[PDB]
Design a protein around this ligand. Structure first.
Ligand code: NA
Ligand code: NA
Ligand code: NA
Ligand code: NA
Ligand SMILES: [Zn+2]
Ligand SMILES: [Zn+2]
Ligand SMILES: [Zn+2]
Ligand SMILES: [Zn+2]
Lengths: 217, 217, 217, 217
């Protein structure tokens, strides 16, 4: 059942609901099974983030929900399902998604920052690994957000851990700001899990330097 | 190249070394590709842990190594490689595996405890999720350790998260004690990663109760 | 300026406000400078918690506040000011005190539990040390809460670290439950701060056993 | 009982031992009760750190100790005792002070860095608050370490939290490096302890900027 569409962007009511007291929906990003965020043109990436944010924020205005979640799963280690490039909008009747997240989960080491947008790496992440926070203070900076998401995603798929293949996008409307948390997803090394013996560098300053090389142009 | 064998238990020098200044070895647990820890007889489970611990502790006595690691990977989310049931012994020339682990990573909520052995759940885990610590104070309690590993593994594969399919074993020789940390491995739910919205119960007391039901006999 | 009184219990508008966009108040617990929670009779402890909770919850109903905080400071390491036995009620126009606290900060190792009340020790504390959570699901169990606070306070001042002298009380209205978090306050040992070398036992199970000895009667 | 002296620098065997299987000593920094690290001349600060490090590292060479700790307590919230400006050297027969500290407790956000020395703020602190790590890779850079300690201390006593009055110094000999962890000590705000409502900025990037202003000359 079609909720809204814009070209190849399609917003569907999820046919397989698994969460009680929730309105589950799926957002198809393209009519092609090859393309994703790293491949999309600047216009398609701009239109996709504008469509997603608009329908997320307008559904929250519906008094039948306490809060509405907007998020993405990509790769076999994100927790997704469909092979097609898609996002999800879940309206929740009794759950407030901000409840168990704090302000300091979105603060950190600045990679890029100006009056319009801020890109940082969490020094107090939600789960304890790498989390990239992209914050805008005005809705008019949505095209800047879309560009920062695309570059951070491109970095995760290409240079972070010499290619990571899986990630998540999480959106938040907190303190009148729109935040996108970009989270790489990977099977952690057994030597790190049991003995905190890293293979690569665990330095947040090294991630900062190599991610900053994606905003040099 | 064969290092030691005992029936179907085979200790091999790893033919694909990927870590410099380390002696990598593989320990094949059975001559069958169907059996694993949850399936093995009490005798085979006893013989496998006795063989593994003996060769781990004797290799550390070799002055060419600072420390020697004994660990296992099981399932597609552990970080392993071979489909066959195997463990690994890695001799490290300049690394001490205890360096970045602390005493409190092995303390916790007691599930089972007596003069010979202790089974607990980490209240200060190494990575931040569920970690089962099995501690013995004397080498003579090795058959008790083997039984506790098998039951904890059986619980992880059967009831924890209604079946977990993947886990890790990590062995430590700390404060003159032999510790086995049993760690379930699973792709964390996206709603938990980004919003700490759990699907199941996150209560350590609930895990304690349902794991204790495996030691009722 | 008197807001409400009940015998020696006096609710005053704080004459020294230091927080902008907040209504600061002070709650004097007794007309004596010798008595405190550990000394008070069962009736005075019951009347003090009933008065405090009632005025805290009724002030939150005032549309001029986003949230209202109810808390106590005791001893020279709590962050208090007056030597007299007092509590504080702070009405906040734009701050929601639940924002940066999560559900798991109130879960833990059960010390005492029944259908009416639950006493636990945080396995995921807010700050990282010992935190005692006393939870009631119905307002009618307020006299049970008052008794559990008094015993937990008595334990902190007497046996925890062989006498702790300082603590905090924090009240929360979360998921239709009334929670009191009892937090001991002490200058942490320098050997622990810099090297995690403890003087006493850091085991949550040992605190559980010795606190349970205060509910044996 | 005098162990070593250099002008007003006096190394004494602690007359009040309270730790069994340890050799406790006290290091008096000056013959005056007014002076401390922030006041000392560049020469006295250089001579004090050279004397302290030399006697710390030489005592560890004594086979009667597993490890030797070098640390300082300053102010009423550090955990010290004497009002006089002093440090402590504790030889421990069976304890290795590195056991429960990891490599990542000394990594972080770089404030100052060159080939000789590195000053950072912990992104993974030992206790969870602000920790300043000063690392040198060669013993010849000891006068640079002494200057960085003095400036970081001066900042803590003057601008951090508009004056902090208390701090700790912790020294470590790890991975053939000499590390000094400078830790401010203060009574945490009750609104932060119970509700993570900060009074000041909790941003590591703000501390980085204002501490960097002490190395502008
Ligand atoms: Na909350
Ligand atoms: Na260590
Ligand atoms: Na929140
Ligand atoms: Na260790
Ligand atoms: Zn803009
Ligand atoms: Zn035994
Ligand atoms: Zn009741
Ligand atoms: Zn130098």
């Amino acid at each position: 059942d079609i909720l809204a569409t814009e070209g190849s962007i399609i917003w569907l009511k999820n046919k397989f609901p698994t969460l009680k007291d929730t309105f589950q929906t799926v957002l198809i990003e393209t009519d092609n099974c090859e393309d994703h965020i790293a491949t999309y043109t600047e216009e398609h990436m701009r239109s996709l983030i504008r469509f997603s944010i608009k329908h997320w924020l307008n559904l929250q205005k519906n008094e039948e929900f306490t809060s509405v979640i907007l998020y993405k799963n990509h790769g076999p280690f994100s927790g997704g399902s469909l092979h097609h490039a898609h996002m999800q909008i879940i309206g929740m009747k009794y759950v407030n998604y901000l409840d168990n997240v704090e302000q300091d989960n979105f603060q950190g080491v600045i990679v890029q920052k100006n009056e319009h947008i801020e890109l940082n790496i969490s020094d107090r992440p939600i789960i304890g690994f790498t989390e990239f926070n992209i914050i805008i203070e005005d809705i008019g900076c949505i095209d800047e957000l879309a560009n920062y998401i695309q570059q951070t995603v491109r970095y995760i798929l290409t240079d972070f851990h010499k290619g990571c293949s899986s990630y998540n996008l999480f959106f938040y409307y907190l303190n009148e700001k729109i935040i996108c948390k970009v989270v790489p997803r990977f099977v952690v090394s057994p030597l790190y899990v049991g003995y905190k013996i890293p293979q690569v560098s665990t330095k947040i300053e090294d991630v900062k330097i190599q991610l900053a090389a994606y905003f040099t142009k």
